[PDB]
A paper describes a structure:
Actin binding by [name] is mediated by two portions of the protein: the tandem calponin homology (CH) actin-binding domain 1 (ABD1, residues 1–246) and a series of spectrin repeats (SR) in the middle of the protein comprised of SR11–SR17 and referred to as actin-binding domain 2 (ABD2; residues Phe1461–Gln2209). The ABD1 of [name] is a member of the calponin homology domain superfamily. CH domains are found in a range of actin-binding proteins and consist of approximately 100 amino-acid residues with a characteristic α-helical fold that includes a core three-helix bundle and two flanking helices.
The structure of the N-terminal actin-binding domain of human [name] was determined at 1.94 Å resolution. Each chain in the asymmetric unit exists in a ‘closed’ conformation, with the first and second calponin homology (CH) domains directly interacting via a 2500.6 Å2 interface. The CH1 domain is highly similar to the actin-bound utrophin structure and structural homology suggests that the ‘closed’ single-chain conformation opens during actin binding to mitigate steric clashes between CH2 and actin. There were four protein molecules in the asymmetric unit. Based on the refinement statistics, the closed-conformation AlphaFold2-derived molecular-replacement model was used for further refinement. This choice was supported by the presence of inter-chain 2Fo − Fc electron density for the linker region connecting CH1 and CH2 in all chains of the asymmetric unit. In domain-swapped [name] and utrophin dimers, the linker Gln134–Asn137 in [name] forms a helix that is extended away from the CH1 and CH2 domains.
Author numbering: 13 to 244
Write the structure that this text describes.
């Protein structure tokens, strides 16, 4: 349940969702389009709201300066970072590029989205509180019993139940239960979240309806849902 090709795809979809939020250009390849250090600075500009000027020049030292600026901003935001140096990003290291993007997603999409609730509940484990939120929210949906952020989501019922429990107005639950295809249920939830909740479709059905669902991708998407669903 730690799947790196799926992570490449879904993390890139999240990065481009941020860029869509700010009207900037999308990236096409996560292991090439971050090397010059510019688009990382664009992403951190969008996330921090601060201007992060780029170095001028097309040599390796300018990319290294850009990435050093990005890493200094991350450390200034108390971000939990992987063991990384600027050269690892400039030179296209796959695992550490994925790991930096995951550090960013976890800091902003997960921890920061959930920070006020966690300070209220006086809890620190983000996964425990998010799992409890899903479980309590879907307690009265009988086809749903979420115990993890992987296989509990594969048949598409838990996602539709999480959406429905916070917005019972959007659809009739029995219409989803009557869908025998987990692909149709997953697409149904994805389309609701995309067009009625403003969440980019970070996940494909095959990223969830699969033998080993990627835990980080699902956690990312579920915390984005937590970010936009009403919890009055």
């Amino acid at each position: 349940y730690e799947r790196e090709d799926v992570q490449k795809k879904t993390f890139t979809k999240w990065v481009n969702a941020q860029f869509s939020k700010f009207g900037k250009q999308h990236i096409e390849n996560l292991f090439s389009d971050l090397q010059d250090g510019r688009r990382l600075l664009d992403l951190l500009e969008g996330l921090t709201g601060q201007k992060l000027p780029k170095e001028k020049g097309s040599t390796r030292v300018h990319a290294l300066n850009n990435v050093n600026k990005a890493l200094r901003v991350l450390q200034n935001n108390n971000v939990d970072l992987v063991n990384i140096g600027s050269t690892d990003i400039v030179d296209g290291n796959h695992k550490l590029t994925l790991g930096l993007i995951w550090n960013i997603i976890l800091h902003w999409q997960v921890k920061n989205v959930m920070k006020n609730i966690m300070a209220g509940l006086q809890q620190t484990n983000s996964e425990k509180i998010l799992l409890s939120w899903v479980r309590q929210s879907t307690r009265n949906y009988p086809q749903v019993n979420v115990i993890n952020f992987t296989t509990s989501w594969s048949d598409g019922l838990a996602l539709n139940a999480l959406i429905h429990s916070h917005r019972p107005d959007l659809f009739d639950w029995n219409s989803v239960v009557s869908q025998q295809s987990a692909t149709q249920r997953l697409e149904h939830a994805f389309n609701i979240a995309r067009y009625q909740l403003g969440i980019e479709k970070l996940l494909d059905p095959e990223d969830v309806d699969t033998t080993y669902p990627d835990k980080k991708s699902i956690l990312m998407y579920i915390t984005s849902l937590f970010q936009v669903l009403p919890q009055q």
